[PDB]
Design a protein around this ligand. Sequence first.
Ligand SMILES: Nc1ncnc2c1ncn2[C@@H]1O[C@H](C(=O)N2CCN(CC(=O)Nc3cccc4c3CNC4=O)CC2)[C@@H](O)[C@H]1O
Length: 240
Amino acid sequence: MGWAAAREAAGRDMLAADLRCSLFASALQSYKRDSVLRPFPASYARGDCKDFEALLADASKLPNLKELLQSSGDNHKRAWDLVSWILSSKVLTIHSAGKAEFEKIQKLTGAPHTPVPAPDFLFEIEYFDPANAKFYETKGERDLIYAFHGSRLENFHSIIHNGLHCHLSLFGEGTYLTSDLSLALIYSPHGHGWQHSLLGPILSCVAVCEVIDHPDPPKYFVVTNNQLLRVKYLLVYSQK
Ligand SMILES: Nc1ncnc2c1ncn2[C@@H]1O[C@H](C(=O)N2CCN(CC(=O)Nc3cccc4c3CNC4=O)CC2)[C@@H](O)[C@H]1O
């Protein structure tokens, strides 16, 4: 996606654009970047060779999104290229939501049984076709379940773009979900986001999943076929 298209997208929802940059920074900065930074910007790869040192360096030169947008940049050329890539997707996009939807989420997942904190920011994932149509076609007459999934921040760039995978032979294969946000949170410790983020530099992210209902101390449950679920919301918490 081009620079003018990037500037319109970022201007329409800066906190959603900022999140996508913060989640990219978190994956990039992680020692696990080789595996967690997927999708990877092809501009920073030769063949199979990913140049994480070029990418880490260029990432650390990105100004905050207010500065990037207010600066008429042909000098912020490398930054625009990178932010344009970050905010591009033909499959989905992300939308800032108000805590008028945290009420909705709570109603969908079920009233909490244990004290829980309120997210500082909430975000919804909009899926475009064929992906969107495919999900509802798979769903059919079956009703949708809403459950939480906690994870380390460096995993959310890959979780969002590639979806939740199923494994990591051993113990327990499939994705673990819970209707108690207090259980999901123990799997979502604070991680390092982006120093120029409007959300703040240290964040915790919890996913809300749309689960197609099929026979599948707080209670939890496991989803083995990954065609039956998708991240629909993101609960973001900033450390103060
Ligand atoms: N596309 C992806 N990119 C990077 N990580 C991805 C990914 N898709 C899934 N994952 C990540 O894989 C990790 C994974 O398989 N794991 C890690 C931990 N483990 C058990 C476990 O998940 N238990 C478990 C138990 C109860 C509740 C919750 C969890 C997790 N979240 C919860 O809310 C099972 C194997 C996982 O943490 C997940 O968030």
